[PDB]
Design a binder for this molecule. Sequence first.
Ligand SMILES: *[B@@]([O])(OP([O])([O])=O)[C]([C][C])[N]S(=O)(=O)[C]C1=[C][C]=[C]C(C([O])=O)=[C]1
Length: 360
Amino acid sequence: NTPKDQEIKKLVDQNFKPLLEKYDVPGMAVGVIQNNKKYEMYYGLQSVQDKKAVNSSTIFELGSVSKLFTATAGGYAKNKGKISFDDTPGKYWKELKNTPIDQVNLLQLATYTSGNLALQFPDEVKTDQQVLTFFKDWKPKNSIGEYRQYSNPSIGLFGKVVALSMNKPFDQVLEKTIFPALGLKHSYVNVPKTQMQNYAFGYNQENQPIRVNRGPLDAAPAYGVKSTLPDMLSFIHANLNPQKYPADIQRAINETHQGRYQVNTMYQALGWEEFSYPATLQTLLDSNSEQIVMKPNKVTAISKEPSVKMYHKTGSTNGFGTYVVFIPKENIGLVMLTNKRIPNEERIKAAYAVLNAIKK
Ligand SMILES: *[B@@]([O])(OP([O])([O])=O)[C]([C][C])[N]S(=O)(=O)[C]C1=[C][C]=[C]C(C([O])=O)=[C]1
């Protein structure tokens, strides 16, 4: 009939390719891994003005999908005995001792339940001293641990503490320890001059070329990672097959898969969002609703510990969109990278359509 690689390509053409015209997206990379076979599909241009095609070397900004690597780094440090998730940040960043934030433990930072951390650092918070001041001036609002409010400073502080516990800067933790352990060869916190020719332009909603100029250094654990489609497929492979990796990074990956609490049908793991599988489309869309992403929500203890589960994460920057999803017992995952934002719901819907139509 039709070879499997062509069937997958046809499904990506049917569900992802129309998004390029619908949202005026210059370039897109979509990868599927099924049963340890990788399928890569590249569309469009990484630079419109250079007429340079998206390809396996194209580097994209991951946005909030960066939090998955921070989560993995925390799991690595935990299982090396360098941190406990019950520790507080003042144990490692001593200037935070005797401050309100030092009542919040590392797990609560990593899963957004400190009770009073907003979505972004304030624009004025740019230097290391302003970040220290920001956290020193933090006072609790809600009871610690009771409410989830998605927050880049929350996981930024987590990543900074993880890096302190390993005695290296966070960029070095990823680029010298975690990325190599996962087998990634073109993933970066700082893209080197030798790779600039492969770093896609991002494109804003007027289709003007832009790129993340970021904020403070301690925001990098929240959204500072750049990667290629092959590298993100390797990362999905690692999450699908942790048993194939050395003990330290295997235990780190498994740590990121552990659900910690629920908000309705979402399980909050470390970095990853987790769902009982099969998941309804609406369950996956609800995880990205304004109510969940933008408002505080009371957390509840896990009741059903799902045996059969799936995980996903969206990420965006001003000029890039990302979506990653994987389903362990179906041995399958998908990554989408674009150099223009498109609505999260469209990313989720298109991936749902593809993954559910691929023949087992
Ligand atoms: B993350 O990407 O978002 P989700 O909703 O998990 O998909 C993150 C959190 C909202 N998005 S962000 O705050 O917009 C990342 C960001 C922050 C500051 C500056 C920039 C940029 O592009 O310059 C991006």
